[PDB]
Each structure stands twice: as structure tokens, then as C-alpha cells.
Design a binder for this molecule. Structure first.
Ligand code: NA
Ligand code: NA
Lengths: 9, 276, 99
């Protein structure tokens, strides 16, 4: 299952 | 044995050819089990291994929501990084991300990973402590400040030590007949005269899983590293892999050469010679 | 900074003339990801070719597998034609059942 939180760079 | 789970993301801009493409693939060891492609006619998370098919609609919806959100996040990140490197709006650029967890033979967390690259160069990586970041340059330092404010490392540590290991253990159980089965290589040595003075000995390894293997040639018991032609391990298309190693030997000296094979599917490493 | 593709052309199963097999063209170690890959039969493009989903290695270079069903023979010539931004002209790599 993938990571569910956004990571805007 | 030891097992890992990884997600691989690729976000590619293409100015004048629409919005950036986002693709995500998921692996357990060397087995792909999911894909998501924002360019697909109707983008959805799709199964790519039979053992993932038993997952219910809530699983497929949840994955799709995450990857659709990632598609938008990565388009913003591509804009941001173009800005950080003062690049023109004309060029195509790529962000890649790879993350996941490694388990030991006991099934315990060995370590977590979360690494990102920009145009194929390391950009930012989560340190092995799962608490701090390694930024490659002053541009990656800007991402680092943002990620510190959003508590990203703390969120990743929770995921990597939690849901990542949990779902990996679930997949390993559901796909135990394949994922927990090591297929040893089928090995043989071929001989190809290249002249009257020399011949090529090629040591083959076929049908093995997982992809990790060691193929070496020895001459009178010593490694021929500099004189061995080693091809990259390659997929057969049926889950297994193939590899070969070759040495050019003087005619009549063939029996002084031995091929050595190490693979998880092999109790003990193998020793082969050309059998005329 | 770009990386040119490594190309391997080979069969899934050991090649036996007149026996159905799969012809593979594995492209790897390249960057950026756009790539053109064609499987050729006597210099002619094979129309029904499938490929794997885009993924990459620990060094960030991409890799893809292009494959099709084929029945090898003594007279037919197979190859893989690849083009990438790093190549001035497409690279043709012939299938050698000893490689
Ligand atoms: Na898209
Ligand atoms: Na080109």
C-alpha cells in the first residue's frame, strides 16, 4: 500500500 | 528470506505536449504488483500480479485516490523545481521517487527508504534514522524546509515502520507460493572458437528468481574480474531472470577455467566447467 | 546530463527452430525516459509488440522490456531498433541466439 500524504517539493 | 517493498514514481514534464505524466509502479522484491499511469485512457490503479487481485474495491479506490493526488502534487513540484534551478519553461524535466521498507529473514524491519531525484541526479533523501534529510544542493534545501514544516519525516517514519511493513507481510502471505519461492538458475557453459589461438567460454544462468545472482570466472582458482564480459541481469518475461559471463581463453587451456554461481535458490555455490 | 540505453536482444526460452518462443528487447540504463523501441523481422517492424511498465534502477536509470511471440528459424533475421535522445541515428542490435 503506498504512502498517503502529499509531499509538494 | 529477506524481502522488500518499493514504490517507484516518475513525473515527467513535456512543455507544449500537455501536463506532466505521472506513473507509479509497486514491487515486492523483483515482482511488480501494481501500476498507475496518468496518461491511461481512464487512470486507475491496476493489478499486475495475480495475488493482488483478491484485494477489494476499497483497496483499488484508496490507491487510485493517492496516485491521483500524487499526479497533482508532482505537477506542482515540477513547477517548483524548474523555479529553484532557474530553468526555462522550454525543457522537459523529470522527478523520480523510490521508497519502501526492507525486512530481514525474521520478517522484522531492517530499514526504510525514501529518495528523490531530479533529472536523474540525487536531490533529497530520508536518512536511515527516518528523522532527518540529506539535501543535495541549495535547491533541495528549499524542499527540506518545506518538509520539516509539514512533519514529512515523522509521517514517513510512521508509514515505513507501520503500514509499509504490515502490507508487505500481507502480500508475502497472499503470494507465498511465488514471492517466498526462490528459483535456482539453470546453468551451462558454451564454447565458441574466436580464432585458432583463442575461444570464448560463456557461463549461462537461466530461469532464476529473485534477480540477485553472482556469476564469476576463475583461472587456476583466481577471479578474472578485468577479463570477464558480464551482461546486465535481464528479465525473461515470465518472472525469471537471465545472465551470462564470458571469458576469452587460449585454445587448450579451457579446463583451467571455472564458472562460479551463487544464488538464494542454491544451498551451496556451484562450480562449472566446459564439458566437451 | 543524459545516459544512453544498453540493449539486449534475446529469447525467453532456449531457441529451438520451428518452436514458438518470445523475442525480447531489454533496454536499460537510459535517461531521460522517452525511448522508441521496435522489434524487427527481416528488417520489417513487428506490429504486435507489448512492453513492461516504466520503472527504474537504484542509479535512477530507466529500464523497459519489449516482447512478442516469435517462432525462430534458420533463415529469419530478428533485431531490435532503438532510438533515444542520446543517439544521432537509431541503433539496430541483431538477435544472436548465443547472446
Ligand atoms: Na498525464
Ligand atoms: Na535520437
Amino acid at each position: 500500500l503506498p504512502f498517503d500524504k502529499p509531499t509538494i517539493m | 528470506g529477506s524481502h522488500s517493498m518499493r514504490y517507484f514514481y516518475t513525473a515527467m514534464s513535456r512543455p507544449g505536449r500537455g501536463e506532466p505524466r505521472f506513473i507509479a509502479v509497486g514491487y515486492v522484491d523483483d515482482t511488480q504488483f501494481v501500476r498507475f499511469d496518468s496518461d491511461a485512457a481512464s487512470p486507475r490503479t491496476e493489478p499486475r500480479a495475480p495475488w493482488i487481485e483478491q484485494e477489494g474495491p476499497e483497496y483499488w479506490d484508496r490507491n487510485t485516490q493517492i496516485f491521483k493526488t500524487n499526479t497533482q502534487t508532482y505537477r506542482e513540484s515540477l513547477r517548483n523545481l524548474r523555479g529553484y534551478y532557474n530553468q526555462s519553461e522550454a525543457g522537459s524535466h523529470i522527478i523520480q521517487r523510490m521508497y519502501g521498507c526492507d525486512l530481514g529473514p525474521d520478517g522484522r524491519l531492517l530499514r526504510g527508504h525514501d529518495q528523490s531525484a531530479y533529472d536523474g541526479k540525487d536531490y533529497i533523501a530520508l536518512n536511515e534514522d527516518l528523522s532527518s534529510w540529506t539535501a543535495a544542493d541549495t535547491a533541495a534545501q528549499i524542499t527540506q524546509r518545506k518538509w520539516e514544516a509539514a512533519r514529512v519525516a515523522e509521517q514517513l517514519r510512521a508509514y515505513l515502520e507501520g503500514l509499509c511493513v504490515e502490507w508487505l507481510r500481507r502480500y508475502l502471505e497472499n503470494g507465498k507460493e511465488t514471492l517466498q519461492r526462490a528459483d535456482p538458475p539453470k546453468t551451462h557453459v558454451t564454447h565458441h572458437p574466436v580464432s585458432d589461438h583463442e575461444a570464448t567460454l560463456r557461463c549461462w544462468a537461466l530461469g532464476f528468481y529473485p534477480a540477485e545472482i553472482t556469476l564469476t570466472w576463475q583461472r587456476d582458482g583466481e577471479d578474472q574480474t578485468q577479463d570477464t564480459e558480464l551482461v546486465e541481469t535481464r528479465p525473461a518475461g515470465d518472472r525469471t531472470f537471465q545472465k551470462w559471463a564470458a571469458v576469452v581463453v587460449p585454445s587448450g587451456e579451457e579446463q583451467r577455467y571455472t564458472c562460479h554461481v551463487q544464488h538464494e535458490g542454491l544451498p551451496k555455490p556451484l562450480t562449472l566447467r566446459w564439458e566437451p | 546530463i543524459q545516459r544512453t540505453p544498453k540493449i539486449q536482444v534475446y529469447s525467453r526460452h532456449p531457441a529451438e527452430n520451428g518452436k514458438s518462443n518470445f523475442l525480447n528487447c531489454y533496454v536499460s540504463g537510459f535517461h531521460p525516459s522517452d525511448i522508441e523501441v521496435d522489434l524487427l523481422k527481416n528488417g520489417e517492424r513487428i506490429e504486435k509488440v507489448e512492453h513492461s511498465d516504466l520503472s527504474f534502477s537504484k542509479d535512477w536509470s530507466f529500464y523497459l522490456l519489449y516482447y512478442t511471440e516469435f517462432t525462430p528459424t534458420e533463415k529469419d533475421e530478428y533485431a531490435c531498433r532503438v532510438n533515444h535522445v542520446t543517439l544521432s541515428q537509431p541503433k539496430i542490435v541483431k538477435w544472436d541466439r548465443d547472446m
